[PDB]
């Protein structure tokens, strides 16, 4: 069952995705074929070798330097319209990608993504558009990366009401907090973190809780099918004592609160390193706990790859 | 999109499933109708009220008593051939129920079950049959009950190779071991558990690791698509120091081992009460930890209900 895919973005995640696709292009009797890849240097399109495109991108920074192959310069809208993949995969850092998704879904093309803002802000609209056009949208790696919290909430627990979710979903903050608690100061830990590439030059998205808040909104969308009415977002800047503190997202019907919270030493959310975790409390089950890596190339691409096979087999979108 | 369901068995689990179905019969624009229920007293078939049938079974022990219906004494095969449900739901303790599943799958009827031996011993044959007849088989509650380990392994991690799984899946042994660690002797720990309903008169399935072995076998099936070549099963009879000991199932390609293991106090497998836990190690993800309740009527019916919804919508059976 042959499917053509366009990959938009070719960063740490897209390249790691290429490796997984190359190794598993025929799985469950499906056949996955990447017809295009797109970065800021333009879009390559046709019968190129996936691994060569990955080699080229790694070694030169650009898909344009590709050998034996020609580069087109599609805007997002034109990529969709000209190449016409079965599935558009977004693994870029373009915040406004929703406009692109609207065009694909308008044409019946399913979208798979690791990119958070479009889903966090436009889920309802995107879902309506997908349903109208007989397509799907999948976003597993937007929350806890390849650890399958989205699958769990969206395709399982189908007879449950979700009372709440509490999750620690931002390893950058965890690193800072762990350092503060070890002796270092806020600014020094921020500085040590920049130096390791775990924070960016402007560290705000992590430190002020933005990333965590986007992810919580995605959890709230899946769980209740609507945006929250009460919202609180706080970062870790005022944290004085960091021992056993984590930046915790607390989601319940109509309400999201992201803020630092103290945890007993045996709480499942007291996660270290790259780990994330979620406690989902439902009516029939009580607490269900899921824990796994929340970041990294392969880790993230694992999730997008799952979503690919699901778009291909037309998994429904029940939530 | 309307579906008829035959519930086979009506014990703790089937009665809780009647409640969840009554609360959520029209969900995701599906419409669930229970057209038959079957216990050892016979099968009721028709327009009976679901909750009444539950009330009567609970008060009297038998489906016979319902006002205005008389049971039919159907063999499993006659049940299937006459009632012709779209989904057959097995929530019974009948070990050999695979014989009934063959009949149903033979007719295009999908099977949802919480009953372990058929899946543990016949998954291959059942899955082939389902595929040949355009049907699915779902078994979420055969392992860790409503905690969605089967969903996670079977429909997620689709780009992954499962290196191993370690899982504590039998709360009864946890209760015994916890008593032993508190001072009690084996035989008293046992007797106390009988008195509380946690073990049966023959407690062997729990104590000698059989339940856990079946569960390990199912996880192996889903992870590798074949039976294991080597098999080790040990119970808890010989345990002496029970402190922090749990009966642990270990799965990896071609093998399963069930045995008691001492565990460090921060190991996620060191669960208490009704809790179960699974640690799934994959190539891209490392350790993925899932934890939740492993037993209880509502808890087990929750997983069954999810499976009903997936059966209705024709979810694929990738693994
Ligand atoms: N890595 C991780 O741990 C995780 C990442 N994510 C998300 O997945 C996405 C990918 O992240 P990652 O691979 O790490 O990030 P990188 O910054 O490594 O990759 C970003 C990619 O997006 C491309 N890109 C950005 N804007 C555009 C545009 N406007 N047009 C065309 N191409 C564009 C970049 O192009 P170029 O190479 O040409 O600059 C680059 O190829 C992001 O949304 C991120 O938030 C989610 C969970 C975990
Ligand atoms: N309770 C739990 O926490 C869990 C249970 N399970 C499994 O789910 C299944 C149901 O468990 P549960 O509800 O607790 O068990 P119960 O012992 O409460 O119920 C068993 C039911 O199956 C019926 N049954 C047994 N044999 C036959 C037969 N030959 N024909 C018709 N009906 C039959 C019994 O009928 P009658 O009432 O007439 O005797 C009874 O209704 C079992 O396979 C169990 O292993 C799985 C995970 C967790
Ligand atoms: Na995820
Ligand atoms: Na389960």
Residue numbers in the entry:
A (entry chain B), B (entry chain A): 1 to 319
Paper text:
The third enzyme in the pathway, HseDH, catalyzes the NAD(P)H-dependent reduction of Asa to Hse. In the present study, we expressed that gene, which encoded a HseDH homolog, characterized the enzyme produced and revealed the enzyme to be a highly thermostable HseDH. Each monomer consisted of three domains: a nucleotide-binding domain (residues 1–139 and 297–315), a dimerization domain (140–160 and 266–293) and a substrate-binding domain (residues 161–265).
The structure of substrate-free P. horikoshii HseDH was determined using molecular replacement and refined at a resolution of 2.30 Å. The asymmetric unit consisted of one homodimer with a solvent content of 70.1%, which corresponded to a Matthews coefficient of 4.1 Å3 Da–1. The model of the dimer contained the ordered residues (1-319) in each subunit, two NADPH molecules (see below), five 2-methyl-2,4-pentanediol (MPD) molecules, two Na atoms and 212 water molecules. No cofactor was present during crystal growth, but this molecule may have originated in the E. coli cells and was then retained throughout the protein purification. These results demonstrate that the molecule bound to P. horikoshii HseDH is NADPH. The electron density corresponding to the NADPH bound within the nucleotide-binding site of P. horikoshii HseDH was very clear, enabling us to place the ligand with reasonable accuracy. The C2 phosphate is tightly held in position through five surrounding hydrogen bonds in the wild-type enzyme. The two nearly identical subunits (root-mean-square deviation (r.m.s.d.) = 0.35 Å) were closely associated mainly through hydrophobic interactions around α14, β14 and the C-terminal region (residues 314–318) in both subunits.
